[PDB]
Amino acid sequence: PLYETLNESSAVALAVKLGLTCQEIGLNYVFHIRALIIKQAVPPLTIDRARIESSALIRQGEHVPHLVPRVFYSDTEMAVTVMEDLSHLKIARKGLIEGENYPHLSQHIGEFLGKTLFYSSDYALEPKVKKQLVKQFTNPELCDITERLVFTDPFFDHDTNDFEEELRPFVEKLWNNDSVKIEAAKLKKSFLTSAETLIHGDLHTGSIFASEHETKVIDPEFAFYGPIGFDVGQFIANLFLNALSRDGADREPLYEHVNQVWETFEETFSEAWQKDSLDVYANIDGYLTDTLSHIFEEAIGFAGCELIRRTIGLAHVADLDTIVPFDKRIGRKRLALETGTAFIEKRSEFKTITDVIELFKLLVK
Amino acid sequence: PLYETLNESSAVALALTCQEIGDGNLNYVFHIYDQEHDRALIIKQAVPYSWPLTIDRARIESSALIRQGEHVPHLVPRVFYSDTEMAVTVMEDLSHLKIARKGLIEGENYPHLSQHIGEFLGKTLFYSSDYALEPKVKKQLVKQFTNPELCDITERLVFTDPFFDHDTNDFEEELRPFVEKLWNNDSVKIEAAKLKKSFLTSAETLIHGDLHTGSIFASEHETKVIDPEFAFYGPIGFDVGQFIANLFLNALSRDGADREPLYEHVNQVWETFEETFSEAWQKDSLDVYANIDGYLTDTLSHIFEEAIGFAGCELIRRTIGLAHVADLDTIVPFDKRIGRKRLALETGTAFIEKRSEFKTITDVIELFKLLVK
Structure with a gap:
């Protein structure tokens, strides 16, 4: 050996x-x-x-x-x-918590998202080529971690969960919520089955190196053929997680980032589609638009799982855990649960990224 | 080698004695008959050495x-x-036994066909899915059953070619006005594209991939599903939709009250599928979510919607595509053939467009009946 x-x-x-x-x-x-x-x-x-x-x-x-x-x-x-x-460079999560606003973070990650996600899909590749890549990037053990941690364990009384006792009443509300859990299940089923493109699989603010002028996405070890919306949802959720760690007007840069990442993604994916699609259907008025609406809906659903999972699951984020005082921490963690839940259940109601942002803002006032 | x-x-x-009896030209089938026992x-x-x-x-x-x-x-x-x-x-x-398509055209009704196919569908489709298998086990099966060449046949013939002026299409000139109508229909083509995208990407269970009436051997009391060479990890509703569409294709070749057994078969196959899938789900799901009230129900509604959309693709595909069905091509006289082929295009289009509006299998049957009066 x-x-x-x-x-x-x-x-x-x-x-x-x-x-x-x-x-x-x-x-x-x-x-x-x-x-x-x-x-x-x-x-x-x-x-x-x-x-x-x-x-x-x-x-x-x-x-x-x-x-x-x-x-x-x-x-x-x-x-x-x-x-x-x-x-x-600095890990983006660390910089964001220190109060760095990284003006270009969302433009860079939007471009990463739109190009990586388009160019490994059936839209961009001969189906026989893509089918071989699906085999190549099959990733059963790292997928297992995500299938359990992001999509399952937070939603039941499972061993891997880690949360404060003061959070218990709001955790048990979630566990007892049939309708949200049915939605979490559908989203997990899409994660398990929807082999749409080669995804990063763990695109949080801890998987990004940043300075004022540079952005680099690192650690794509969770990569596999999964749903296009997933990387988009996890990134957005982690921007919202940082927003929750901030107060008042200091949140605005993060909301701007949410807006800009979706906008840049949608425009990058759209440019790539227009230029490089192999699909005879690509040029029919309304097909790209409906494709984007489904990516958007899923992304918002996956963002809600990430919001919840990071709050009470095995793997926490420093954004929430380092909030002080303790009572403020519990309050913001309750809001992460509640916004994540709204995201999951209302995902098909949102029309634009602005609607997502405005709902989030309302809930967290 | x-x-x-x-x-x-x-x-x-x-x-013993041997005769080559292969139906197509891509496979040899050697029948060996002995006379120590029969x-x-x-x-x-x-x-x-054909596609x-x-x-x-x-x-x-x-x-x-x-x-x-x-x-x-x-x-x-x-x-x-x-x-x-x-x-x-x-x-x-x-x-x-007899190929089911052949028997149906001859007027055989095969009373148990849908009961048997429904059970096949519910069990094959459930037991190779993530609902039934550890995800790590299922992921290795996706690799093993990756079927790029046969998938390419279906991606072209079921989901793409009929919907544009492509060289694989084969239709009578009399049909042209109605064919061009489809090609010019943006909203149905956008729906066909979404259905194709699910075919390309939704690795939900191990499917048969070509479950039409020509892929079944039948007698009055027996049903056997054959030729699963198109098998791969695809959408659960696919085999369900193709089978159902081929029942409707036979109904179209029939007249009047003769159609009823086929309508009963569509009803029964959905119902047995749903029942079978549901029983397997209850007893053998590994999923912690499986018994949350409303999860099986919503899962079935999605299977149903996709099934009806795939049925519509099959209805259209068999009428104007490369691979026709004997149900429609052997309709006489010629003018009646053209009329029934127009209806297959029209019912197929409606299925695709309205797939999310149907609530039950009887909604689908009643819409079909109205359209084919």
Whole structure:
């Protein structure tokens, strides 16, 4: 077997053996070594995610090379990906909580979303080509994490949930809500079955490096063929999660980001569709429009699952957990549950991104 | 390479007397009949040398038949042996039965056809879905049953070509005015496109993929579903819609009160499907959501809507596309044939456009009846 777990010394040796000072800065080792990053999966989760991540980064790079790190080398057996150093940037979630507003974040992520999502779909690819990519990017273990954490466990009294006792009354309201859970189920069924395009699968503010002028999407290890709306919904939900961690007028930049990411996505996806669709149906008046309306509806539903899941599930976000004082934290966490719920149940009622934003604003006053 | 094309002698050596009896031209079917006992056997083999198609479909077909046999062994031929590289499937002889399409055109009513097909549909469709399987297991089955070439046939012929002026279409000049009407109908074509997009993307369960009346052997008391070579992970409503559409295609070839058994079959197949799917759901779902009141109901409404849309595609596709059905082509006289073919286009279009408005299977039957008066 070719697999050996790396150390600072074997990492530098490998960088040299490929012709391209070391500190481990990381389930994953990250070796920072001009500069370079050598990422390695450690063996509970398969090391195959490293193959997915590298391949997904490379596919993303054909369309948006400026929005993802460049990959210099990958090895499936060693579960290694050698890539661009982005140390000089900050994780978007961390920056946002510190009060950075990143003026271009939404334009950049909108463009990422519109191009990555269009160009790996049946709209852009011969069906026989896409069917082979579905096989290639099948990702059963990482999908399992999402299927459980985003779509199932928050909605029942399951072991993996993690929430304050003061939140219990509002958590049990959700658990006892048949109609929202039926909707969560439909959304999970779409996640399980709708192999529409190659998605990132975990596009939150913690999977983005940012400065004032730059944006880079990282860690596409959850990538697989899933619904187009999913990456869009998770990103939007994480902007709303940051809004909830802020007060008053300080929220406005995040609402502007929600608006702008949808707008840029819709326009980027639309330009790509007009220019590069292989589909004889693509040019029929109203088909692109109805396609977008369905992406929009799903995205809002997936945003609501992400709002709820991050509040009471196993994997929390720092936006909510670091809110002080404690009583303010409980209140804002109740609102994340309630807005997430409204998003899920009302997803088909919204006509524009502005309606989504205005409903959110109303609820969180 | 192990592949060698069989002949009558080769086939007996592998497995008395042997006759090649293949219906199409893409497959050999060797019937082997013995006289120690009056026992018999079928050796099917894919021929490479027609739509150009690889011989891999033989692997899909045998695998699909074996999977179906786990849940409905009484509704599919038994498989005794299969070989991927030889593209061979050795299976149960069903020569004593009649192709259902042929029998229906002859005026056979097959009282149990819909009961049996409904059960086939409910069990095959449920037990290969995420409702019944661990998602990690189902995901490996999606890979195993990936069927790009046969899917491409359907994507073109069912979902695309009839709706534009494409070279695969085949229709009488008398039909042209009504055909051009369809091509110019933006709103129905947008709906066909959505249905196609579900076909391309909704990997919900292992489907048969070509479940028409020509893919069924029948007698008064027996029904067997054959030729699952188009099988892949696709939308649950697809097999349901194709079958139903082919019942309606037969009703169109009939006159007056003779149509009633076919209408009863449409009613019964939906009802048995829904019942069967529902019983399987109750007893064998792995999903924590499965018993929340209204979830099975909404899931069925979606299956139903898609089924009716796919039925409409099939109604249109069989009328003006590359692959016709004997129900309509053998209608006499010629003027009556043109009239009934116009109606298949019209009912197919209505099904597609109105699919979300129907509440029950009887709504669909009653609309069809009105349109075909």
